[PDB]
Paper text:
The crystal structure of the complex between [name] and [name] was determined at 2.55 Å resolution. Two copies of the complex were found in the asymmetric unit. The antibody recognized the loop Gln23–Thr32 of [name], consistent with the results of the epitope mapping experiment described earlier. Binding of [name] to [name] did not result in major conformational changes in [name] (RMSD10-99 = 0.74 ± 0.44 Å) except at the epitope region. However, when analyzing the relative position of the two [name] molecules in the hypothetical dimer, it was clear that a strong overlap between the antibody molecules occurred. Indeed the overlapping volume between the two molecules of antibody in this hypothetical complex was exceedingly large (3,380 ± 254 Å3). In contrast, no structural clashes between the molecules of [name] were observed when the strand-swap dimer was employed as a dimeric template. This structural analysis suggests that [name] inhibits the X-dimer through steric hindrance between the antibody molecules on two [name] monomers. Based on the crystal structure from above, we noticed that the antibody [name] induced a conformational change in a loop of the epitope comprising residues Lys25 to Arg30, which partially blocks the interface of the strand-swap dimer. In particular, the conformation of the side chains of residues Lys25, Asn27, and Arg30 changed under the influence of the complementarity determining region (CDR) H3 loop of [name]. Superposition of the complex and the strand-swap dimer revealed that the conformation of the side chains of residues Lys25 and Asn27 in the complex with antibody would specifically clash with residues of Ala5* and Asp1* of the second copy of [name] in the swap-strand dimer.
[name] is a member of the family of classical cadherins, which is the best-characterized group within the super-family of cell adhesive cadherins. Structurally, classical cadherins consist of three distinctive regions, namely a five extracellular (EC) domain, a single transmembrane domain, and an intracellular domain13. Classical cadherins mediate cell adhesion when the extracellular domains of two cadherin molecules, one from each apposing cell, dimerize in a cadherin-specific fashion. Importantly, the formation of the strand-swap dimer is preceded by an intermediate (transient) homodimer termed the X-dimer.
Author numbering:
A (entry chain B): 1 to 118, 133 to 244
B (entry chain A): 4 to 100
The structure:
């Protein structure tokens, strides 16, 4: 099966550099782009950039240009991110994620690497707003979570589920299409600027935080997330 | 990867699109397409072609099954720089019916 193993937690002093590994297995390493993302406590997600391990082409979010360096080792199926000039604001959980499909989505994620430390440009940055930050519903219910873009994103909208583990999964990509192994009770819809994810027959398994992400334009951007209890 | 079926002696007009080449890196990088093989850049030359910027495979001429029943071509995806992004993708084209 597809697996991305990330390296252990880091504890460094200000001004230092650190380097994280992301070891791929269960697929042909060079046939898929590798993206990295940052999540600061508690839950905001930011796109760092990606590397194409086949060509070596890299694309950075203007925000992380100079702060982050992406490389790969083809012979060990390992992707690397170095973070430099470290400050307290770099303290976050960082993630490895594979670009899955022609129409977008990041289909598999590493478990994350925690960094504890004791940038920007002229591109327009599409804002993804999830108007509800916290939602409480009952077992067996049907529930709708909403997402809005500052711009028409022409259906390039994906949904992720994060468990209190830190573990992340792709639920839906390109507005409505389901990632394999995702039950039918998850379904998404929308068009233009407005999108939504609907979960039916809520289960204990669904206690999680749900995140939308736009794939219309660089830099990729996420919504703030919607937390789901019971 | 699924073979592309083309009926013989099609009316056209030509060139006509057959199938669109897709890379799983397309959302991330602007990808440019080219093709090689007997049928494109070796004999019979120029029967098939591709739209560089869209990846749409083109057929330039009506196909005759009595002459050639099947074609095997290779699709190539490069970045703006000209750097390859994938191994060559196999393109099978079967003439019907
Ligand atoms: Cl998959």
């Amino acid at each position: 099966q597809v697996q991305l193993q990330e390296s252990g937690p880091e504890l460094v002093k200000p001004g230092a550099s650190v380097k994280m590994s992301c070891k791929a297995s269960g697929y042909s390493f060079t046939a898929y782009n590798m993206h990295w993302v940052k999540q600061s406590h508690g839950k905001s997600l930011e796109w760092i950039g990606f590397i194409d391990p086949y060509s070596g082409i890299i694309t950075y979010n203007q925000t992380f240009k100079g702060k982050a360096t992406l490389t790969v080792d083809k012979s060990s199926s390992t992707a690397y991110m170095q973070l430099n000039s470290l400050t307290s604001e770099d303290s976050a959980v960082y993630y490895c994620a594979r670009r899955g499909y022609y129409d977008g989505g990041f289909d598999y994620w590493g478990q994350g690497t925690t960094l504890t430390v004791s940038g920007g440009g002229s591109d327009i940055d599409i804002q993804m707003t999830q108007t509800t930050s916290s939602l409480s519903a009952s077992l067996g219910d049907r529930v709708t979570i909403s997402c809005r873009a500052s711009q028409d994103i022409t259906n390039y909208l994906n949904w992720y589920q994060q468990k209190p583990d830190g573990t992340v999964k792709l639920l839906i990509y390109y507005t409505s299409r389901l990632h394999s192994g995702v039950p039918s009770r998850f379904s998404g819809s929308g068009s233009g600027t407005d999108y939504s994810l609907t979960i039916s027959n809520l289960e204990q398994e669904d206690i999680a935080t749900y995140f939308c992400q736009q794939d219309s334009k660089h830099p990729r951007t996420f919504g703030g997330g919607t937390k789901l209890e019971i | 990867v699924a073979p592309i079926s083309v009926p013989e002696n099609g009316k056209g007009p030509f060139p006509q699109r057959l199938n669109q080449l897709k890379s799983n890196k397309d959302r991330d990088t602007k990808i440019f397409y080219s093709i090689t093989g007997p049928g494109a850049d070796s004999p019979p030359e120029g029967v098939f072609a591709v739209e560089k910027e869209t990846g749409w495979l083109l057929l330039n001429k009506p196909l005759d099954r009595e002459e050639i029943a099947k074609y095997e071509l290779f699709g190539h995806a490069v970045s703006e720089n000209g750097a390859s992004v994938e191994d060559p993708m196999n393109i099978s084209i079967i003439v019907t019916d």
